[PDB]
Each structure stands twice: as structure tokens, then as C-alpha cells.
Design a protein around this ligand. Structure first.
Ligand code: NA
Ligand code: NA
Length: 327
DNA sequence: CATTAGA
DNA sequence: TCTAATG
């Protein structure tokens, strides 16, 4: 956690670099399990050889561990860090829509800058266009104060369209968070569940409304169950317009709301921990259900959930307010 | 680890 | 169809 920090951090740098600038999923996977194991290791790695004993660590990495242990750096790292091409890819990649694959390509063609990207908006698809368009806004955190106004809006319309709709803003925001990266609304309806052959308009009706009143202002991707746009707070009485925020909305079979809802509220750790718990308690939990475990090794049989509570009760735990779902 | 664009 | 990118 801090005993092996540099080593891991270096290893991760290396990893990430393989995967992105180069297409070396292997090396790239190497550096990762290595970085994974050395992390767990309960003592101070004092040399390569020591590390070397570790599963996942071989001659390659050890040698890096030495250089790094020896002199506070690493050449490859010093080289990579400096390297234009490499830096370029790491950056383009910042744009919503541009992955590594495309980042490599662009660069190859000579697009390395945001400006480059402009002059060639043409080479970019829709997504990427928006991403480039709101690059600044997209990189900004969402102040909870604002989250509150947005939630205020989304809920109201959802309702207006159909009062039968159940919407919940999930994420860190749900967990008390001072700021957030983007708004994630979870949604379901009664007439929509596990079996009931869909109802696409269900997602659509609402999306339509949001755009209708100008809350949603762009569409990165809209399908029958997941919508992925951009929204914005009505820039009040001039002088202060609001930044463009990422927003996602997902339809859910009512019969699998809360599990999902649980899930997305996080945190990543409370989850795991919640999940690990259910196991002892004779269960299993996943993004959609909670099935009683059977002794034969495994089992199925989706238990009936009406609220976050039921899930808890099942595993016989203490209802934990989102606020404290931090771990 | 699943859903969507795209080509 | 696959392969990318987000989450
Ligand atoms: Na080894
Ligand atoms: Na990106």
C-alpha cells in the first residue's frame, strides 16, 4: 500500500504504456499481474531477486526493479515520458470518443494536438465531435450543488411523462459525494421486467422529454436501454452559463432495479465487501439479482427484491445508508 | 462485461 | 460481421 508504491507505480506506468502506445497486451498483461502481486507482498522489496521469487515476476521486471531500487528512476520510463509520440497518444485519448486505437491512427496521420483535431473535424465521428466540442466541460467535476439542480429536473419530467416511472440518481452523488464526474440515472418501470418483451419507447419517451425542455443537448449514443448524452443547466439570467455535463440513463426491468441500484451506488469496495458477504451468508450477488447458493458447488433461483433493504435482509446485514456505503 | 456505433 | 469505446 506504501511499502511497495514506487515499484507498483512504476510497473503500472510500464503496463499502461504497453497497452497504449504499443499493442502489447501480453507485456501489458505481464506488468499488471506483477504489479498486482508485489502489491500484496507484506514486506519491503529490497532487490530484484527478492521480488523475483514472486509468481508473475521474472527476469524482465526484476531487472527493472533493480534499476529502480538502485537509482530513483528507470531509463525506459525516462525515455517513454519524454517521447513525443507516446505523449501524443496519451493525450488524444483524453477526448471522449477517442480510444487508443484511434489515438494511434490520428497520430500517425499527424494529429497530435487539440487544434489538429479541429482542422480535421471531418476525420472524427459524431461521438468524437462532441467530445472535442466539450473537451473543457467534460474534464470538469460536477459540483454537488449543481447535481441537486439537475436531479431536480430529471425527476420532475420523468414523472410528468409517466408517473409510473421510478428514477434514481446513482453514483458517488448518491453516496454523499461533494462532486461527481457525471450524472448516472437508473430507471425502470412496472410494465418493464425480465420477461415482458421490452418497451423501447419507455427509454425514448423520457429522453424525448429531457431534450424537449432543453436539458439534454446532445446524444452520444441512444439505444433501447442505455442512452448516453450531454446535458446542461439552463444558463439562468445571463453572465453565467453552465458547463456541458455527461449524462447517462438506463432502463431496467423493474424486476432487477435495486440490485442494479445497489451496485451502481458503489462503492467499488462496499460492493465487493457486500458481495463477499452474501457468499458466506449462502448467496451470490451481481448487477441484477441475488441467488441462494446450493451446496453442489453452485446454484440459481433469483430472490425477489422490492428495495435495497430486501437485499440486505437476505444477507442478514445492517441497512447501510448510501452515505456510508463507502466500504 | 454489456451495450452501441461504425464501417 | 467485428472491432472500438464507455461505463
Ligand atoms: Na517467479
Ligand atoms: Na477518450
Amino acid at each position: 500500500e506504501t511499502l511497495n508504491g514506487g515499484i507498483t507505480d512504476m510497473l503500472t506506468e510500464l503496463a499502461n504504456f504497453e497497452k497504449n502506445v504499443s499493442q502489447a497486451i501480453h507485456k501489458y498483461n505481464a506488468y499488471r499481474k506483477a504489479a498486482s502481486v508485489i502489491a500484496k507482498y507484506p514486506h519491503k522489496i529490497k532487490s530484484g531477486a527478492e521480488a523475483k521469487k514472486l509468481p508473475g515476476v521474472g527476469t524482465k521486471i526484476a531487472e527493472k526493479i533493480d534499476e529502480f531500487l538502485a537509482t530513483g528512476k528507470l531509463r525506459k520510463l525516462e525515455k517513454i515520458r519524454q517521447d513525443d509520440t507516446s505523449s501524443s497518444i496519451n493525450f488524444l485519448t483524453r477526448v471522449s470518443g477517442i480510444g487508443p486505437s484511434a489515438a494511434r491512427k490520428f497520430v500517425d496521420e499527424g494529429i497530435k494536438t487539440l487544434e489538429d483535431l479541429r482542422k480535421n473535424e471531418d476525420k472524427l465521428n459524431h461521438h468524437q465531435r462532441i467530445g472535442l466540442k466539450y473537451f473543457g466541460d467534460f474534464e470538469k467535476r460536477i459540483p454537488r450543488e449543481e447535481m441537486l439542480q439537475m436531479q431536480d429536473i430529471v425527476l420532475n419530467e420523468v414523472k410528468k411523462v409517466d408517473s409510473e416511472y421510478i428514477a434514481t440518481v446513482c453514483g458517488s452523488f448518491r453516496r454523499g459525494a461533494e462532486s461527481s464526474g457525471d450524472m448516472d440515472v437508473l430507471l425502470t418501470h412496472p410494465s418493464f421486467t425480465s420477461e415482458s418483451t421490452k418497451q423501447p419507447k419507455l427509454l425514448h419517451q423520457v429522453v424525448e422529454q429531457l431534450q424537449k425542455v432543453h436539458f439534454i443537448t446532445d446524444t452520444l449514443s441512444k439505444g433501447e436501454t442505455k442512452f448516453m448524452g450531454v446535458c446542461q443547466l439552463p444558463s439562468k439570467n445571463d453572465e453565467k452559463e453552465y458547463p456541458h455535463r455527461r449524462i447517462d440513463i438506463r432502463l431496467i426491468p423493474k424486476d432487477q432495479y435495486y440490485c442494479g441500484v445497489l451496485y451502481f451506488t458503489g462503492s467499488d469496495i462496499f460492493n465487493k465487501n457486500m458481495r463477499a458477504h452474501a457468499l458466506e451468508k449462502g448467496f451470490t450477488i451481481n448487477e441484477y439479482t441475488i441467488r441462494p447458493l446450493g451446496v453442489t458447488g453452485v446454484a440459481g433461483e433469483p430472490l425477489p427484491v422490492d428495495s435495497e433493504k430486501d437485499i440486505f435482509d437476505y444477507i442478514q446485514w445492517k441497512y447501510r445508508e448510501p452515505k456510508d456505503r463507502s466500504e
